[PDB]
């Protein structure tokens, strides 16, 4: 069991938002997909509580209304977990956790892979467990686990990690590896406000598989094709060409039934506005929708023209994946 050795954190331990850039659904059949971990991340910072037991937490992230309130059950089966997991017992002196960061936490960015990710590097910190990156990861994996669910560890890879990531289903369960790129990222993430269970929507998918078999191969093949295209663009650089093909998938994804009218109001606003590319991500009938800017001041006329042109566009957020390399 461990015990404290610091009394209060002092570093900087954060969790990464997620964005599915490419192959949402597909990779559940054995596709690659490509995760973006993103700069905009969740803090978790901790101190001890002396004769206060348990764990008091301070949630100040800038979530969308409702949003801290309807995940808190979840959030204390969670946090339970990685404190289970790192052995750490707090039924005589507890802690005070406060989390932060600027990531707003809704459906579709991985908020609470992010939030699990910070808590087990400041747990790291205070009872000096030295975790490395790979220990972090399974304990925000496990933590994930009490929210529901069930984690396929991409959420929780790309807040630990960070950058872009290769995931895919492999002999045969989740591998992941890094993505390297010399550019920078400009993101708008819009959510819906929209809530969708994943576990609904997958097994839709599998049903439309079962009923379509040929069909579905084809859409599947079409898919391979693009992301294979996808990774040429990004060793290449070519962001015009990386939008091209989020457009591509986007096609596909309403084509495998997972968008909605109000994900659609979005990306056809986000491409009138000179969005490079635009498309739904993650689970999809509502959640987020992802649109790449060629810049920071061409990503400014897309905010400015969701803002104006689409009511649909819920909650606007400018979001980086920062470069790999120099
Ligand atoms: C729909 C899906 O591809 C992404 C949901 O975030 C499911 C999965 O990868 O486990």
Same mark, same amino acid.
């Given at each position: 069991?461990?015990?404290?050795?610091?009394?209060?954190?002092? #570093?900087?331990?954060?969790?990464?938002?997620?964005?599915?850039?490419?192959?949402?659904?597909?990779?559940?059949?054995?596709?690659?997909?490509?995760?973006?971990?993103?700069?905009? &991340?969740?803090?978790?910072?901790?101190?001890?509580?002396?004769?206060?037991?348990?764990? *008091?937490?301070?949630?100040?992230?800038?979530?969308?209304?409702?949003?801290?309130?309807?995940?808190?059950?979840?959030?204390?089966?969670?946090? $339970?977990?990685?404190?289970?997991?790192?052995?750490?017992?707090?039924?005589?002196?507890?802690?005070?956790?406060?989390?932060?960061?600027?990531?707003?936490? %809704?459906?579709?960015?991985?908020?609470?892979?992010?939030?699990?990710?910070?808590? !087990?590097?400041?747990?790291?910190?205070?009872?000096?467990?030295?975790?490395?990156?790979?220990?972090?990861?399974?304990?925000?994996?496990?933590?994930?686990?009490?929210?529901?669910?069930?984690?396929?560890?991409?959420?929780?890879?790309?807040?630990? &990690? #960070? #950058?872009?990531?290769?995931?895919?289903? $492999?002999?045969?369960?989740?591998?992941?590896?890094?993505?390297?790129?010399?550019?920078?990222?400009?993101?708008?993430? =819009?959510?819906?406000?929209? +809530?969708?269970?994943?576990?609904?929507?997958?097994?839709?998918?599998?049903?439309?598989?079962?009923?379509?078999? =040929? *069909?579905?191969?084809?859409?599947? @093949?079409?898919?391979?094709?693009?992301? !294979?295209?996808?990774?040429?663009?990004?060793?290449? #650089?070519?962001?015009?060409?990386?939008?091209?093909?989020?457009?591509? +998938?986007? @096609?596909?994804?309403?084509?495998?039934?997972?968008?909605?009218?109000?994900?659609?109001?979005?990306?056809?606003?986000?491409?009138?506005?000179?969005?490079?590319?635009?498309?739904? %991500?993650?689970?999809?009938?509502?959640?987020?929708?992802?649109?790449?800017?060629?810049?920071?001041? $061409?990503?400014?006329?897309?905010?400015?023209?969701?803002?104006?042109?689409?009511?649909?566009?819920?909650?606007?957020?400018?979001?980086?994946? *920062?470069?790999?390399?120099?």
């Amino acid at each position: 069991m461990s015990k404290p050795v610091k009394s209060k954190t002092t #570093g900087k331990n954060i969790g990464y938002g997620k964005v599915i850039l490419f192959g949402e659904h597909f990779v559940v059949h054995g596709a690659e997909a490509i995760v973006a971990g993103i700069s905009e &991340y969740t803090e978790c910072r901790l101190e001890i509580n002396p004769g206060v037991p348990g764990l *008091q937490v301070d949630d100040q992230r800038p979530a969308i209304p409702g949003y801290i309130a309807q995940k808190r059950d979840e959030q204390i089966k969670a946090h $339970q977990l990685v404190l289970d997991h790192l052995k750490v017992d707090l039924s005589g002196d507890g802690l005070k956790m406060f989390i932060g960061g600027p990531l707003v936490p %809704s459906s579709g960015i991985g908020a609470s892979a992010s939030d699990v990710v910070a808590f !087990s590097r400041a747990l790291s910190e205070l009872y000096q467990l030295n975790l490395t990156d790979e220990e972090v990861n399974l304990s925000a994996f496990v933590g994930e686990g009490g929210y529901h669910g069930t984690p396929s560890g991409a959420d929780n890879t790309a807040a630990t &990690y #960070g #950058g872009l990531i290769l995931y895919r289903r $492999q002999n045969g369960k989740s591998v992941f590896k890094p993505i390297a790129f010399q550019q920078r990222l400009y993101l708008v993430v =819009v959510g819906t406000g929209i +809530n969708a269970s994943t576990a609904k929507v997958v097994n839709d998918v599998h049903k439309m598989k079962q009923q379509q078999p =040929v *069909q579905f191969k084809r859409l599947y @093949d079409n898919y391979t094709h693009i992301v !294979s295209q996808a990774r040429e663009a990004l060793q290449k #650089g070519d962001l015009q060409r990386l939008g091209q093909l989020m457009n591509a +998938n986007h @096609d596909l994804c309403r084509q495998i039934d997972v968008s909605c009218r109000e994900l659609e109001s979005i990306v056809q606003t986000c491409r009138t506005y000179g969005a490079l590319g635009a498309k739904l %991500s993650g689970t999809g009938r509502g959640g987020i929708a992802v649109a790449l800017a060629a810049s920071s001041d $061409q990503r400014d006329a897309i905010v400015k023209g969701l803002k104006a042109k689409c009511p649909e566009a819920k909650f606007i957020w400018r979001y980086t994946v *920062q470069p790999s390399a120099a």
